[PDB]
Amino acid sequence: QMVKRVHIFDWHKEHARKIEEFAGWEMPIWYSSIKEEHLAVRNAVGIFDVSHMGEIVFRGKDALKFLQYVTTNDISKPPAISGTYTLVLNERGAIKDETLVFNMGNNEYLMICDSDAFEKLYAWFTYLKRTIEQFTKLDLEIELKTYDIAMFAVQGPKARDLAKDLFGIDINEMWWFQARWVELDGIKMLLSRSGYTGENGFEVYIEDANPYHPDESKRGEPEKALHVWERILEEGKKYGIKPCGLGARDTLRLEAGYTLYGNETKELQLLSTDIDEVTPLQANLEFAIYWDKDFIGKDALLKQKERGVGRKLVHFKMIDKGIPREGYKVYANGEMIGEVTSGTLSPLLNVGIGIAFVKEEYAKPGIEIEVEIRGQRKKAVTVTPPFYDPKKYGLFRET
Amino acid sequence: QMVKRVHIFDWHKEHARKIEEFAGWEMPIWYSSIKEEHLAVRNAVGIFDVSHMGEIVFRGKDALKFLQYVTTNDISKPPAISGTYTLVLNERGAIKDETLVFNMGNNEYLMICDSDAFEKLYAWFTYLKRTIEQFTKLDLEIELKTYDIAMFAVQGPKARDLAKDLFGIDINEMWWFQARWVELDGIKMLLSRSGYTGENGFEVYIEDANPYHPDESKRGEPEKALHVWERILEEGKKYGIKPCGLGARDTLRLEAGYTLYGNETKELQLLSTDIDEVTPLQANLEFAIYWDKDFIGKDALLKQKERGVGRKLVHFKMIDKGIPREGYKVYANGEMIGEVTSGTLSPLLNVGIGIAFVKEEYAKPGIEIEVEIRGQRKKAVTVTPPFYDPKKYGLFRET
């Protein structure tokens, strides 16, 4: 399998202290340190290259109805140009991926999905489209744009001032998930107010040549993407900006409490049952479901409500030392209640924090539990995210 | 939830020595012994109750085209009434299930599928159908008939004589997978020349009331199914027929070398790739693929040929003592090459036999390998199935 590399991979290879395979992409894990980058986002501003995230575009008079049946939320709600968080479920209710769909206007929709799931999603949607086309003509085009679009995330309490310096816009006047077309030094790009850190911020989407594009005929110097990257670091210097790798991306999202597909959410294609896992009901993502419409996997969710979800996600923080990690067994009163799905050392708290999938009766805050780390039972307690004080950190901190 | 039980479960409860809840169903594992039942099929004839296998019926003028796009083989070839072995793949080429589809004539198709996969398949086909229906009307109805249809398999070198006595037909005049309507004491049923043992044989499908039907309102006494079962045992007595449980069903299929969905074949929904596992190319099931048409998962298979399958199934038999079992590590030429997917003690050879998923370069016969069994590397050798002597046992025996 070909290794996946983002447009400005060379810049990362030259500046990152650690480059390693992530979702098949050779990505920068950190440049200075995970702690410094994490705190830069919490205290100032940081920029992440997330060009590895998937981008799938749907165009045509039949795009809306198609997206309405294959995803869980009301795709007709967001006005152009803005998005909505929506899940893509399989035939028995499990999550194929968590996504963000933007209504770009003119019957065009842009879906941002996970780097570890975009190939599956593209095949999914493409074969669903071809299945329909065996019986009727459709006005629907589905194009994979992951390798064509460079995407950067600028996050932190200073991201707003930085965006003002760069584009002359105030992201605070935009609602979350709203987007708009902007330009920087002659370079056109889409800008959305969004993020994966818990802080205020924005993300830009740039169409540019990728020297590592799978399609040899589409390869070229990432002149535009690199220019924007360097310009943001330039204008961000006055704010103490730092380039941030995937290490801090994970510590920041965990502190905020966000799920990560492949860890908290996934599809197991379980044998011998009419309800697959993990479903939105087991991951506390029911808010992403518009129940008054039909969609793939809906029947299984209705059945799951009648029987009980069995297991649910729960956030927890360590009391003793040890960093919880995926797979570690979790106990309560001596009885095994589940396993850790994500874990890491919080740069803010300076104690391990994580998420676990446990018997649903334990998915509540304030419960004393134990996590087995390398043969040792380490104490922890369940909590309600975020892990930080929302009055001090995060986009809603007091001013 | 309700424990699933076949139509004539009460008969099994009264005649089996071992009944165990396996995968949501309370089934007979053996009546006399696994060895005796295994040998009865190899030397005489045996009858298995496989009423737990799935049955999904497709009806309508659009059924053929639908089945052609969602399965791998050429569904248009079997004439009424006969079937074809066909695979159902996911969007990235992995196997959702191995199935047998019969052309019943007059826009009707009967699909026999795995007990551990029929709920997934029904949801899959139903949602594909509903997705199409969002854009156009269809003449297609898909019904789950698993609980309505009792199914028995009669296998062994004397199965042919037994079918002659019972129905007045000669299965040797039928091609494999061919079927026809037969009648016994006024009870009409479908009969196919098929089997999961490696021996000659037939299977009957009987629509009858199920006292353990999930739908309470449909429950009734299985008079027809029980009558047929008892009559087969009655007429089979002269041939030394024996009722056979799930234990022998597994030893016989493994000895013949057949794959078992959930073990050899399965869909992992792998992250970060455009090709899922396990595909037909990895399970040596390419013969079930009609390449000239388009079908769900085809692209992934074409790409897999370009890059190489990586891993393939291989059959092996123990030289040293010990029984290989699912999960055991396999080694060769000083390195780990894979893991066992199925293993058992061959009642006929009295040595361990199994199938393993290994690095493709080792998926050849005559290779000396080792299987880790309870901390010891036990010697084994890869072979070409079946494990039994095809001149002495199986459908092609010469005497």
In chain B, where are the structural domains located?
Answer: 1-52+145-256, 53-144, 310-384
Contacts of A91 in chain B (CB under 8 A): 120, 123-124, 126-127
- Residues in chain A whose beta carbon is closer than 8 A to a beta carbon of chain B? 1, 23-24, 62, 65-66, 69-70, 91-92, 115-117, 119-120, 122-124, 126-128, 130-132, 134-136, 138, 262, 266-269, 271-274, 276, 294, 296-297, 299-300, 307
For domain B53-144, say whether CATH 3.30.70.1400 is its number: yes
Contacts of B91 in chain A (CB under 8 A): 120, 123-124, 126-127
The C-alpha atoms of residue B230 and residue B225 are separated, in whole angstroms, by 9
Contact (CB<8Å) A276/B120: yes
Q: Which residue of B has its CA nearest to A90?
A: B124
Q: Which residues pair with B359 in a beta bridge?
A: B311
Q: What is the CA radius of gyration of chain B?
A: 21
The C-alpha atoms of residue B369 and residue B168 are separated, in whole angstroms, by 49
The C-alpha atoms of residue B182 and residue B231 are separated, in whole angstroms, by 14
The C-alpha atoms of residue B50 and residue B249 are separated, in whole angstroms, by 10
Contact (CB<8Å) A69/B130: yes
Contact (CB<8Å) A120/B92: yes
For domain B1-52+145-256, say whether CATH 3.30.1360.120 is its number: yes
Contact (CB<8Å) A115/B23: no
From the list B229, B192, B207, the residue with the least C-alpha distance to B100 is: B192
Residue that is written with structure tokens 């569904």 in the block: B75
Q: Where are the beta strands (DSSP E) in chain B?
A: 18-22, 25-30, 46-49, 54-59, 82-89, 95-103, 108-113, 141-144, 149-155, 179-184, 187-192, 201-207, 242-244, 311-318, 329-332, 335-345, 352-359, 368-373, 376-383
Those residues whose C-beta lies under 8 Å from the C-beta of residue A120, and which sit 6 or more positions away, are: A96, A97, B91, B92, B269, B271, B274, B276
Q: Which residue of A has its CA nearest to B263?
A: A271
The C-alpha atoms of residue B202 and residue B173 are separated, in whole angstroms, by 12
Contact B189, B231 (CB under 8 A): no
Instruction: Choose among A134, A269, A296: nearest Cβ to B120.
Output: A269
Sign, CA dihedral A37-A41-A47-A53, equals: positive
Q: Which residues pair with A155 in a beta bridge?
A: A46, A201
**Helix, coil or strand: residue B259:** coil
- Residues in chain B whose beta carbon is closer than 8 A to a beta carbon of chain A? 1, 23-24, 62, 65-66, 69-70, 91-92, 96, 115-117, 119-120, 123-124, 126-128, 130-132, 134-136, 138, 262, 266-269, 271-276, 294, 296-297, 299-300, 307
- Burial class from Cβ neighbours inside 10 Å (0-12, 13-18, 19+) for residue A364 reads exposed
Angle at alpha carbon of residue B122, lines to A144 and A272, rounded to 5°: 100
Q: What is the 3-state secondary structure (H, E, C) of chain A?
A: CCCECCCCHHHHHHHCCEEEEECCEEEEEECCCHHHHHHHHHHCCEEEECCCCEEEEEECCCHHHHHHHHCCCCCCCCCCCEEEEEEEECCCCCEEEEEEEEEEECCEEEEEECCCCHHHHHHHHHHHHHHHHCCCCCCCEEEECCCCEEEEEEECCCHHHHHHHHHCCCHHHCCCCEEEEEEECCEEEEEECCCCCCCCEEEEEEECCCCCCCCHHHCCCCHHHHHHHHHHHHHHHHHCCEEECHHHHHHHHHHHCCCCECCCECCCCCCCCCCCCCCCCCCCCHHHCCCCCCCCCHHHHHHHHHHCCCEEEEEEEECCCCCCCCCCEEEECCEEEEEEEEEEECCCCCCEEEEEEEEHHHCCCCCEEEEEECCEEEEEEEECCCCCCCCCCCCCCCC
Contacts of A264 in chain B (CB under 8 A): none
**Distance from the A122 Cα atom to the nearest Cα atom in chain B, whole angstroms:** 9
Tokens of A64: 């809306």
Contact (CB<8Å) B123/A307: no
Contacts of A300 in chain B (CB under 8 A): 123
The two beta strands, B335-345 and A141-144, are unpaired
Its CATH architecture, for the domain A310-384, is: Beta Barrel (2.40)
Contact (CB<8Å) A123/B299: yes
The C-alpha atoms of residue A179 and residue A76 are separated, in whole angstroms, by 16
**Helix, coil or strand: residue B340:** strand
**Helix, coil or strand: residue B238:** helix
Contact (CB<8Å) A69/B131: yes
How many other CB atoms are there within 10 angstroms of residue A351's CB atom? 16
Contacts of A54 in chain B (CB under 8 A): none
The C-alpha atoms of residue A326 and residue A343 are separated, in whole angstroms, by 6
Q: Which residue of A has its CA nearest to B133?
A: A132
Position A27, amino acid? M
Contact (CB<8Å) A276/B134: no
Contact B243, B8 (CB under 8 A): no
Q: Which residues pair with A110 in a beta bridge?
A: A57, A102
From the list B311, B198, B200, the residue with the least C-alpha distance to B257 is: B198
The C-alpha atoms of residue A250 and residue A261 are separated, in whole angstroms, by 12
Experimentally determined by: X-ray
Element (H, E) at B35: helix B34-43
Contact (CB<8Å) B23/A272: yes
Those residues whose C-beta lies under 8 Å from the C-beta of residue A306, and which sit 6 or more positions away, are: none
Position A201, amino acid? G
Contact (CB<8Å) A132/B127: no
Contact (CB<8Å) A271/B23: yes
Contact (CB<8Å) A131/B128: yes
Contacts of B131 in chain A (CB under 8 A): 69-70, 128, 131-132, 296
Contact A38, A252 (CB under 8 A): yes
Instruction: Choose among A23, A91, A124: nearest Cβ to B120.
Output: A91
From the list A294, A345, A285, A347, the residue with the least C-alpha distance to A313 is: A285
Contacts of B1 in chain A (CB under 8 A): 307
Position A186, amino acid? G
Tokens of A316: 């927890």
Contact A205, A190 (CB under 8 A): yes
Contact B101, A104 (CB under 8 A): no
The C-alpha atoms of residue B194 and residue B83 are separated, in whole angstroms, by 10
